[PDB]
Write an enzyme that holds these catalytic residues in place. Structure first.
Site, PDB file in Angstrom:
ATOM      1  N   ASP A 184      -6.105   8.679  -0.374  1.00  0.00           N
ATOM      2  CA  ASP A 184      -5.619   7.692   0.596  1.00  0.00           C
ATOM      3  C   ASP A 184      -4.393   8.204   1.344  1.00  0.00           C
ATOM      4  OD1 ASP A 184      -7.578   5.843  -0.342  1.00  0.00           O
ATOM      5  OD2 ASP A 184      -6.228   5.114  -1.876  1.00  0.00           O
ATOM      6  N   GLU A 226       0.816  -1.218   0.000  1.00  0.00           N
ATOM      7  CA  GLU A 226       0.000   0.000   0.000  1.00  0.00           C
ATOM      8  C   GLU A 226       0.851   1.270   0.000  1.00  0.00           C
ATOM      9  OE1 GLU A 226      -3.124   0.600  -0.494  1.00  0.00           O
ATOM     10  OE2 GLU A 226      -3.912  -1.443  -0.465  1.00  0.00           O
TER      11      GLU A 226
END
Ligand SMILES: [Ca+2]
Length: 129
Positions: free
Chosen positions: A53, A35
């Protein structure tokens, strides 16, 4: 801050992440690697959805945290900027909330792509005797 894989593993272990939501510590560390590349300042401005994000676990601005540039459910009750500092306790508490939802760890698309259904038996081999 950029964690080493083993540094992150031990931090997450200390915050009771091993087996949290049914997922091993290796799975949790793997999600972070893919990620954010272990970087607490990781930031993706335009997600496939449209939201942004934030941080080590790439927590989104639509459901989980709030910045004041779009509407948010803010289910973790937290400003998105607090997911960009060095300390990840609040990131961890939020990720714990995220995994308990219906997708489990499949909430994290990079975990799905790179970690899910993979043999992680040796992934943390350097972190333990
Ligand atoms: Ca934080």
């Amino acid at each position: 801050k950029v964690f080493s894989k083993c540094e992150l593993a031990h931090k997450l272990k200390a915050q009771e992440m091993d087996g949290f939501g049914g997922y091993s510590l290796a799975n949790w560390v793997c999600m972070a690697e893919y990620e954010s590349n272990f970087n607490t300042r990781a930031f993706n401005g335009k997600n496939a959805n449209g939201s942004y994000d934030y941080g080590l676990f790439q927590l989104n601005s639509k459901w989980w945290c709030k910045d004041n540039k779009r509407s948010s459910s803010n289910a973790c009750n937290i400003m998105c900027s607090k997911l960009l500092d060095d300390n990840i306790d609040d990131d961890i508490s939020c990720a714990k909330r995220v995994v308990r939802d219906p997708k489990g760890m499949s909430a994290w698309k990079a975990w799905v792509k790179h970690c899910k259904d993979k043999d992680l038996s040796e992934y943390l081999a350097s972190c333990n005797l």
